[PDB]
Amino acid sequence: SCDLNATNYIRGCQSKTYDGKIFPGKGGEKQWICKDTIIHGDTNGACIPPRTQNLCVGELWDKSYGGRSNIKNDTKELLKEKIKNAIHKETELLYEYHDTGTAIISKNDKKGQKGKNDPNGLPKGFCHAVQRSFIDYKNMILGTSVNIYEHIGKLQEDIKKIIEKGTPQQSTENVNAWWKGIEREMWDAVRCAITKINKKNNNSIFNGDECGVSPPTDQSVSWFKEWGEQFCIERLRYEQNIREACTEKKCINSGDKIQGACKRKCEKYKKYISEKKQEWDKQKTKYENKYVGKSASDLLKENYPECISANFDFIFNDNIEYKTYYPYGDYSSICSCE
Numbered sequence: 001s002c003d004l005n006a007t008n009y010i011r012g013c014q015s016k017t018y019d020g021k022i023f024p025g026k027g028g029e030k031q032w033i034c035k036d037t038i039i040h041g042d043t044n045g046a047c048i049p050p051r052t053q054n055l056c057v058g059e060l061w062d063k064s065y066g067g068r069s070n071i072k073n074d075t076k077e078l079l080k081e082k083i084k085n086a087i088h089k090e091t092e093l094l095y096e097y098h099d100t101g102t103a104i105i106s107k108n109d110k111k112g113q114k115g116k117n118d119p120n121g122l123p124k125g126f127c128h129a130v131q132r133s134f135i136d137y138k139n140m141i142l143g144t145s146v147n148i149y150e151h152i153g154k155l156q157e158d159i160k161k162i163i164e165k166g167t168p169q170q171s172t173e174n175v176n177a178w179w180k181g182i183e184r185e186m187w188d189a190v191r192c193a194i195t196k197i198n199k200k201n202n203n204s205i206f207n208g209d210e211c212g213v214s215p216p217t218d219q220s221v222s223w224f225k226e227w228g229e230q231f232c233i234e235r236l237r238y239e240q241n242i243r244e245a246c247t248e249k250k251c252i253n254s255g256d257k258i259q260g261a262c263k264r265k266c267e268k269y270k271k272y273i274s275e276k277k278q279e280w281d282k283q284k285t286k287y288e289n290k291y292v293g294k295s296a297s298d299l300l301k302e303n304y305p306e307c308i309s310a311n312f313d314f315i316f317n318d319n320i321e322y323k324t325y326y327p328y329g330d331y332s333s334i335c336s337c338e
Contacts, residue, residue, distance in 0.1 A: 002192040002208075004199070012063055013056035013089045016097035018049075019104045030054065032227065033148070034282050040146050040220045043286055047279050048148055049226050051129060052136050056093060058086035060155060067151055069158050076166035079159065080182055083137065084189045090133050091193035098123035099201075104230050105129070109240045121204030122197075125229075127211035130190055132226055137186070139219045141179050143172060146219075187215040220290075221299070224283045228300035231276060232307040235315075238269040242334055251337035258335055266328045266335035273315060273329050280316050 015022055020029040030050035040046035059082040062070040071079055098106040101114055105125035108115045115124030139145035143156040163175045191208035198206050216222075246262040258266060284296040300307040314322075315329050328335035 002195055004192070004196050008085070008088070010056075010058045010085055010089055012061065013058055013086070013093060016051075016054055016093050016102070018051050018054040019097075019102060022097065022100050022102045032279055034279055035148065038146060038148065040286070041144065041218065043220075043290055045282055045286060046146055046220055047223060047227060047283055048146060049132070049223055051132060051226070052223070055133060055136055055140075056086050056090040057152075057155070058082060058089055060086060061151065069151075069154055071155070071158050071162065074162055076162050076178070079162050080185070083141065083182075084186060087134070087137055087186055087189040088193050090137075091130050091190045092196070094129045094133060095123065095126055095193070095197060098126040098129060103129060105233055107233065107237065109236050111237075111241075117203060120210040121201070121206070122194075122210050128226075128229065130211050131216045132222055134187065134190060134215055135219055135222045138179065138183075138215075142175060144219070183215060190215075220283075220286060224287055224296070225299065225303055227279060227283060228307055229304045231280075232300065232304055232310055234272065235269075235310060236306055238265075238272060239331060239334075241265045242269060242331055246334050249338070256337035258337060262335070266331065269331055270328050277316050280312070284312075284316075 017025075017028045018030045020027060030053045032047045032049065033053070034045065034047040036045055038045055060069075060071055060079075062068045071082065074082070094103075097103045101107060101123075103125050105128060106115045106123055118124060118127065136145070140152060140156060141159055143160055145152075145156070147153050147156075160172065160175055163178050164171065167174050167178060190211065194206055194210055195208040242262070242265045245260075245265040246258070250259065250262065251257065252259040257263075287296045287299065288294065297312040300310070300312070311330060314326075317326075317329075326332040
């Protein structure tokens with residue numbers, strides 16, 4: 001029982017580009033943004049996902065002529081409608097972005113090959129992305145996200161004002177109650193969008209509950225989990241590349257040293273790791289001194305099967321001997337000779 005046969009498109013939300021444009025388009029990818037002097041919830045700093053930077057705000061924001069809030073004078077009913085439409089559209093666009101295999105977390109270990117559909121017939125990663133975006137909306141509404149966009153900061157605050165004057169007085173705790181009151185309707189927008197996939201996909205039948213009957217399930221934890229799933233999936237793609245170029249054991253006499261395509265694939269991973277290291281450190285440190293006795297390694301491994309083979313301590317090891325003895329981190333043995 002949805003408006004499945006009621007086409008809707010909204011300005012301000014175009015096809016996703018956060019992990020790069022959809023083929024034949026190229027580049028235009030966003031990167032994780034880690035800030036020092038920011039508070040995410042209760043603690044210092046955070047790393048903002050590419051996907052979060054691409055979030056569909058739909059009719060909540062007017063981008064025309066330098067941007068402005070499109071909800072200044074709205075009732076809470078009109079605001080709820082606008083949020084719901086944005087959530088619906090987000091879900092549609094995330095489907096495209098994962099079904100086309102453009103999202104990093106939708107990819108296979110091997111180039112050109114489609115990532116394996118999840119176990120209900122939806123694109124790899126799609127449900128994870130939809131869940132994350134939903135958490136992102138929730139935190140934007142609650143005013144409990146990150147304050148990186150002055151314009152969104154104005155949205156968190158504009159929403160707050162609409163709720164205050166539109167509900168009986170007892171605030172931010174009222175915004176919490178209002179969110180709780182509409183949460184099912186908002187998830188139902190996700191569920192409706194999934195139902196609309198039947199119109200375009202024939203891998204199963206979709207009832208709308210595939211990404212969960214109920215919404216998920218701490219934004220900083222959600223973001224870090226996303227970072228980890230992305231990292232682990234990318235790592236395995238680096239591994240496949242290394243194995244495709246290095247394994248065949250061509251080692252030119254200098255013992256012997258690695259050479260050609262093998263040396264290049266191995267160096268790309270070394271570079272990747274050194275770039276991811278600062279992100280890991282920030283997020284690990286934030287997670288582990290907030291969640292005392294919990295390991296960041298465990299967080300990722302319990303959640304994503306791609307992380308099982310990652311030794312995070314080894315990969316991001318800052319010890320002295322690790323640099324010289326393992327020039328390519330955990331992949332130094334495939335990136336060696338004989």
